[PDB]
Design a protein around this ligand. Structure first.
Ligand SMILES: O=P([O-])(O)O[C@H]1O[C@H](COP(=O)(O)O)[C@@H](O)[C@H](O)[C@H]1O
Ligand SMILES: [Mg+2]
Length: 448
């Protein structure tokens, strides 16, 4: 067989059977053989096993003559940022992001924080690790501790005009992951009044694993916003490369609408820029990008496709509906911090609530949300859907699965690249009734 921890985009498995210190050391050795010359940045999240896995990675890297730059406990985006900023050969973040207690993992990047994925080196590393029975060598390179965050913090703050910010009251919910450290380092430089929820880093996760999409976790941010009259609320996953927004009513804002909102915010600073978006939900993003004078660029779903497209297009911003936001100035990488700073600046400058910034867009382009289906035969299920709709002659696009545009409504239906699932997204032109009837019709076809 093959090591199951090696996934499409990263390494993730249960400790110690799928991932352990020995495997981590072998990954470090194998990674050294894949990178161009230079040092390697290492960081880790709040999980209990994360430091020991990073230490093993470092031991393997240094046995292979790689200098290591230890940036310590951090968010994933800090590995991306420091890898690029320090002109490193590559970087590894030790993290399980949002997963359970017995699980950990790694996200690997090369120069300029370019992704290393299954077909761009990650499976090559897997195969090297799988066959490596060599004795651990001893270190031939050094490790340096670089825990200064100053350049990262300055970079984050450079996205906003601090003189235009208003003293908004913001709920912030780190979910006992790592985001609170950065909020607290940014706070002396911002006028906001923070209401801190689940703020302390705690790898035992007393308040639940850090996954703001779980309704019970969602409600903790919503309640804090409502009870404190906050302007909005922000929650992060554990490694804080995703952020999640709650308006002043406590309503969680579906991520689709943030792509168009953030695109408009960025285009005010970089006029005429290209904006990359995914194919799942599109109409609102295309319109808002064009209305702000930008050029929208359709791209297959997945961070590696989006980053590659942004690079080839010099795109200023790219966004996925699923809370991933990528910024050219940030080494084309995703940040869970830049988005809320941009939104706080937009609320401050415009005098409009976050609710009102999105309300008309949500009415104009209602969407189903991503609905997942585990079916007996995905290919037969997809064929049942396409046969049912054939007589309507939709405009079809195979950029990523099947996109079908019927005029007043459209869907995207695709197989996940990460799990054996079918994923459905539907949207309409301002018609909630059509959205529901079509979503239910497709759902019935898929399950039949
Ligand atoms: O959810 P994550 O953090 O693993 O995120 C990863 O998988 C997601 C879902 O991919 P798919 O729909 O093909 O399964 C991608 O959108 C995302 O860019 C990628 O970083
Ligand atoms: Mg994450």
């Amino acid at each position: 067989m093959t090591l199951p921890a090696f996934k499409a985009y990263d390494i993730r498995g249960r400790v110690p059977d799928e991932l352990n210190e020995d495997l981590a050391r072998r990954i470090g050795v194998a990674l050294a053989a894949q990178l161009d010359q230079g040092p390697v940045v290492l960081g880790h999240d709040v999980r209990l096993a994360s430091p020991a896995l990073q230490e093993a990675l470092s031991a393997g890297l240094r046995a292979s003559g790689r200098d290591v730059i230890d940036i310590g406990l951090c968010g994933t985006e800090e590995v991306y940022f420091q890898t690029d900023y320090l002109k490193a050969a590559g970087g590894v973040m030790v993290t399980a992001s949002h997963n359970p207690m017995d699980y950990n993992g790694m996200k690997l990047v090369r120069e300029q924080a370019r992704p290393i994925s299954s077909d761009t080196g990650l499976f090559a590393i897997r195969d090297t690790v799988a066959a490596d029975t060599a004795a651990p060598g001893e270190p031939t390179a050094s490790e340096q501790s670089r825990t200064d965050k100053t350049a990262y913090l300055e970079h984050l703050l450079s996205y906003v005009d601090r003189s235009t910010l208003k003293p908004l009251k913001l709920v912030v919910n780190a979910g006992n992951g790592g985001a609170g450290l950065i909020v607290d380092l940014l706070a002396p430089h911002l006028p906001f009044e923070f209401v801190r929820v689940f703020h302390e880093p705690d790898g035992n996760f007393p308040n639940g694993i850090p996954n703001p999409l779980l309704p019970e976790n969602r409600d903790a941010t919503a309640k804090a916003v409502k009870d404190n009259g906050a302007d909005f609320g922000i929650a992060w996953d554990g490694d804080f490369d995703r952020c999640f927004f709650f308006d002043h009513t406590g309503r969680f804002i579906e991520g689709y609408y943030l792509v168009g909102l953030l695109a408009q915010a960025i285009l005010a600073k970089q006029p005429g820029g290209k904006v990359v978006h995914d194919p799942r939900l599109t109409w609102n993003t295309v319109e808002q990008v064009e209305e702000a004078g930008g050029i929208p660029v359709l791209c297959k779903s997945g961070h590696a496709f989006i980053k590659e497209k942004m690079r080839s297009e010099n795109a200023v911003y790219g966004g996925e509906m699923s809370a991933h936001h990528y910024f050219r100035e940030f080494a084309y990488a995703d940040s869970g911090m830049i988005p809320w700073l941009l939104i706080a600046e937009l609320v401050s400058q415009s005098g409009r609530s976050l609710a009102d910034l999105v309300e008309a867009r949500m009415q104009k382009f209602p969407c189903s949300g991503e609905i997942n289906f585990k079916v007996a035969d995905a290919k037969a299920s997809v064929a049942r859907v396409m046969e049912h709709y054939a007589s309507l002659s939709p405009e079809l696009d195979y950029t990523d699965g099947i996109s079908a545009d019927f005029g007043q409504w459209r869907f995207n239906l695709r197989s996940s690249n990460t799990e054996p699932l079918l994923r459905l997204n539907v949207e309409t032109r301002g018609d909630a009734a059509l959205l529901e009837t079509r979503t239910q019709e497709i759902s019935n076809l898929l399950r039949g």
